[PDB]
Design an enzyme around this catalytic site. Structure first.
Site, PDB file in Angstrom:
ATOM      1  N   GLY A 129       3.026   5.486   9.614  1.00 65.10           N
ATOM      2  CA  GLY A 129       4.352   5.389   9.035  1.00 65.10           C
ATOM      3  C   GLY A 129       5.171   4.182   9.455  1.00 65.10           C
ATOM      4  O   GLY A 129       6.295   4.017   8.963  1.00 65.10           O
TER       5      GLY A 129
ATOM      6  N   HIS B 163       0.810  -1.212   0.000  1.00 69.53           N
ATOM      7  CA  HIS B 163       0.000   0.000   0.000  1.00 69.53           C
ATOM      8  C   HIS B 163       0.843   1.262   0.000  1.00 69.53           C
ATOM      9  O   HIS B 163       0.253   2.336   0.085  1.00 69.53           O
ATOM     10  CB  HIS B 163      -1.011  -0.013   1.155  1.00 69.53           C
ATOM     11  CG  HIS B 163      -0.413   0.130   2.524  1.00 69.53           C
ATOM     12  ND1 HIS B 163      -0.268  -0.935   3.387  1.00 69.53           N
ATOM     13  CD2 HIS B 163       0.024   1.220   3.200  1.00 69.53           C
ATOM     14  CE1 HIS B 163       0.256  -0.515   4.524  1.00 69.53           C
ATOM     15  NE2 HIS B 163       0.444   0.789   4.436  1.00 69.53           N
TER      16      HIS B 163
ATOM     17  N   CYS C 237       4.489   1.002   8.887  1.00 69.07           N
ATOM     18  CA  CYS C 237       4.373  -0.175   8.037  1.00 69.07           C
ATOM     19  C   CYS C 237       5.697  -0.436   7.332  1.00 69.07           C
ATOM     20  O   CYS C 237       6.450   0.486   7.007  1.00 69.07           O
ATOM     21  CB  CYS C 237       3.236   0.004   7.040  1.00 69.07           C
ATOM     22  SG  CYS C 237       1.627  -0.084   7.860  1.00 69.07           S
TER      23      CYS C 237
HETATM   24  C1  LIG Z   1      -5.796   1.688  11.781  1.00 67.01           C
HETATM   25  C2  LIG Z   1      -6.487   2.089  10.473  1.00 67.01           C
HETATM   26  C3  LIG Z   1      -7.948   2.420  10.797  1.00 67.01           C
HETATM   27  C4  LIG Z   1      -5.807   3.337   9.907  1.00 67.01           C
HETATM   28  C5  LIG Z   1      -6.414   0.967   9.424  1.00 67.01           C
HETATM   29  N1  LIG Z   1      -7.051  -0.247   9.900  1.00 67.01           N
HETATM   30  C6  LIG Z   1      -8.151  -0.723   9.318  1.00 67.01           C
HETATM   31  O1  LIG Z   1      -8.748  -0.163   8.423  1.00 67.01           O
HETATM   32  C7  LIG Z   1      -8.668  -2.070   9.821  1.00 67.01           C
HETATM   33  F1  LIG Z   1      -9.829  -1.939  10.443  1.00 67.01           F
HETATM   34  F2  LIG Z   1      -8.845  -2.928   8.828  1.00 67.01           F
HETATM   35  F3  LIG Z   1      -7.830  -2.635  10.669  1.00 67.01           F
HETATM   36  C8  LIG Z   1      -4.991   0.612   8.995  1.00 67.01           C
HETATM   37  O2  LIG Z   1      -4.199   0.108   9.781  1.00 67.01           O
HETATM   38  N2  LIG Z   1      -4.648   0.833   7.716  1.00 67.01           N
HETATM   39  C9  LIG Z   1      -5.527   1.404   6.685  1.00 67.01           C
HETATM   40  C10 LIG Z   1      -4.709   1.340   5.412  1.00 67.01           C
HETATM   41  C11 LIG Z   1      -3.340   0.795   5.761  1.00 67.01           C
HETATM   42  C12 LIG Z   1      -3.294   0.519   7.251  1.00 67.01           C
HETATM   43  C13 LIG Z   1      -2.289   1.462   7.904  1.00 67.01           C
HETATM   44  O3  LIG Z   1      -2.581   2.636   8.123  1.00 67.01           O
HETATM   45  N3  LIG Z   1      -1.089   0.944   8.187  1.00 67.01           N
HETATM   46  C14 LIG Z   1      -0.058   1.742   8.830  1.00 67.01           C
HETATM   47  C15 LIG Z   1       1.223   1.711   8.014  1.00 67.01           C
HETATM   48  N4  LIG Z   1       2.170   2.577   8.153  1.00 67.01           N
HETATM   49  C16 LIG Z   1       0.178   1.251  10.261  1.00 67.01           C
HETATM   50  C17 LIG Z   1      -0.988   1.604  11.201  1.00 67.01           C
HETATM   51  C18 LIG Z   1      -1.236   3.093  11.411  1.00 67.01           C
HETATM   52  C19 LIG Z   1      -1.870   3.169  12.794  1.00 67.01           C
HETATM   53  N5  LIG Z   1      -1.282   2.016  13.465  1.00 67.01           N
HETATM   54  C20 LIG Z   1      -0.821   1.092  12.620  1.00 67.01           C
HETATM   55  O4  LIG Z   1      -0.343  -0.015  12.939  1.00 67.01           O
HETATM   56  C21 LIG Z   1      -4.279  -0.002   4.889  1.00 67.01           C
HETATM   57  C22 LIG Z   1      -4.955  -1.234   5.450  1.00 67.01           C
HETATM   58  C23 LIG Z   1      -3.902  -0.145   3.431  1.00 67.01           C
END
Ligand SMILES: CC(C)(C)[C@H](NC(=O)C(F)(F)F)C(=O)N1C[C@H]2[C@@H]([C@H]1C(=O)N[C@H](C=N)C[C@@H]1CCNC1=O)C2(C)C
Ligand SMILES: CC(C)(C)[C@H](NC(=O)C(F)(F)F)C(=O)N1C[C@H]2[C@@H]([C@H]1C(=O)N[C@H](C=N)C[C@@H]1CCNC1=O)C2(C)C
Lengths: 305, 305
Positions: B143, B41, B145
């Site tokens: 950030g 992503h 990920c």
């Molecule tokens: C938590 C949020 C509601 C934002 C979402 N979750 C759900 O939508 C769920 F409900 F499916 F889980 C979610 O994590 N993402 C939404 C979007 C990416 C991922 C994301 O932001 N990844 C971050 C990468 N840097 C790490 C995150 C940030 C906060 N803490 C972490 O660990 C993708 C799935 C493509």
């Protein structure tokens, strides 16, 4: 979100660890530029350690008696001296992996990471606090002496602890990198014990702010308190007094969450007087006191190094 | 003595972390030889992430659209491909700090260290377990990920986790390094939740052996039990069934302490049925299930890497 006991990345320190052997005693040393630092009891036999005269034992050693090994390379020792409880071995090669560093003496309640090592090789990393009674709740076996504790600020490693010994209760004692012990301990194998420990109040408050930040809010009550009335209550429960300095240090978390420090003290006061009634905070059934305010801000704001 | 939640030393992994930026989305990548691995992503805008078509988004990207930075050096991307939920960016420079490594898919109940990173730079290291419901109880912000989880065996890094997302309850989900998610999760911003979690029984037993090793022995009772009768009790308390494989894996700790595994199960059974009566084990008021038998042996025997 989430909140974990988190250590600094250890790579900068890993590149400094070496093995030091004198006779048949082996422990860990810290190699920075062209000096290796290690606990002075490397020069003792097991019998010497019961009541050593370190100055006398060292006088009978020469440079070549110290076997320093960095990986598969032996480092030639070209000088030696004792500074309090640490030996300094000058070697003919500067460590090319030496980071920017400083030697610091930390205060009780401050935290640091420990890189536990055996035979000069890292085994694991964990996060510790200097307790009010000047011990640390570590994890150390035979051969771990010379493992160091450190903090990192951007690119600079602040070394604050070198490990020397284990006290009753399975707690640990050591020195700063100038070889001065934390607390009233000596590097001799004779009965010694730490004083009664106390709970680091400012760190509990920091951790309660971390809980609120993560949505664990059930313990927040409607009340405030004065600093003096809080400290009277905390005293009964063996909590350190909270000073104005501590209140100021808690400012960033207070401002971020919108909860005044004295209001959080009112919540902690209720927790102390009433207990947790079978509930947990951040997954813990006990109040946690080994996160500083800085640790909480760093972890909840993702500061990097 | 002492027993701490202990992470592997992170230096070998620190030398592999890089920043990957596509457009205005930035996260972490893992640079091994001449390939950078990162979550797919990275190619999404915030709007794309609500319901992305990754294959379609990637078709419109070319090599030069990926900005990979290793410290202050930009790495030239010369190829790209998608493998399940991870992107592989081929670059024109092999990472000279690449350790010996393997990609492994771990099983629930196994532990690993996490190196949490932001903008390609390490922030901290902590120890995690793959929960039975295929989440991990991590600590991750925006950030993070591309941060990876790993084990070390002597000189070999086994990478087992790459971080992708956060679920309700503040728990975390991700993939192995082939981009296959652990558990029934997808990398899309839509409501998802983990199943009910369970307690890792074999790890609790390992931790009870660690307690005995450290002299915390009050919970040992006079009784034994059969495996089947233990598993009936554990089931009621949402503990995983203990298998013969688990019993065998506990063999080294059983032999070291002289306490048969089924005798320790009788002690755990009493702890589950009666509670801890206000006592702690290794300082904890709750039974701990994020130490494997191997973790306990390593920490109580000082294995190095
Ligand atoms: C938590 C949020 C509601 C934002 C979402 N979750 C759900 O939508 C769920 F409900 F499916 F889980 C979610 O994590 N993402 C939404 C979007 C990416 C991922 C994301 O932001 N990844 C971050 C990468 N840097 C790490 C995150 C940030 C906060 N803490 C972490 O660990 C993708 C799935 C493509
Ligand atoms: C625990 C023991 C009873 C052995 C003793 N303690 C006391 O005599 C006390 F009562 F004073 F504490 C003690 O630690 N030492 C005795 C001897 C050195 C030190 C020591 O062996 N250091 C080890 C270095 N590699 C690390 C230790 C090993 C076990 N776990 C650790 O952390 C010196 C003080 C010179």
């Amino acid at each position: 979100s989430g909140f974990r006991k988190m250590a600094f990345p250890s790579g900068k320190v890993e590149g400094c660890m070496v093995q030091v052997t004198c006779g048949t005693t082996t422990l860990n040393g810290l190699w920075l530029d062209d000096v290796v630092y290690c606990p002075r009891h490397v020069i003792c036999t097991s019998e010497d350690m019961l009541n050593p005269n370190y100055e006398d034992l060292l006088i009978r050693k020469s440079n070549h008696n110290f076997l320093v090994q960095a990986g598969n390379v032996q480092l030639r020792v070209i000088g030696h001296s004792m500074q309090n409880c640490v030996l300094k071995l000058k070697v003919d090669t500067a460590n090319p992996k030496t980071p920017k560093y400083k030697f610091v003496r930390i205060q009780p309640g401050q935290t640091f990471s420990v890189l536990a090592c055996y035979n000069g090789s890292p085994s694991g990393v964990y996060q510790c606090a200097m307790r009010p009674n000047f011990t640390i709740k570590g994890s150390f076996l035979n051969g771990s002496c010379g493992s160091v504790g450190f903090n990192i600020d951007y690119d600079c490693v602040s070394f604050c602890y070198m490990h020397h010994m284990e006290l009753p209760t399975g707690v640990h004692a050591g020195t700063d990198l100038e070889g001065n012990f934390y607390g009233p301990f000596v590097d001799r194998q004779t009965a010694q014990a730490a004083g009664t420990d106390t709970t680091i109040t400012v760190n509990v408050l920091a951790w309660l702010y971390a809980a609120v930040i993560n949505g664990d809010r059930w313990f927040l009550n409607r009340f405030t308190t004065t600093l003096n009335d809080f400290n009277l209550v905390a005293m009964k429960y063996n909590y350190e007094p909270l000073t104005q300095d501590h209140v100021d240090i808690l400012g960033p978390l207070s401002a971020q969450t919108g909860i005044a420090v004295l209001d959080m003290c009112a919540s902690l006061k209720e927790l102390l007087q009433n207990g947790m009634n079978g509930r947990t905070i951040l997954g813990s059934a006990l109040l946690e006191d080994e996160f500083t305010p800085f640790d909480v801000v760093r972890q909840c704001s993702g500061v990097t190094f």
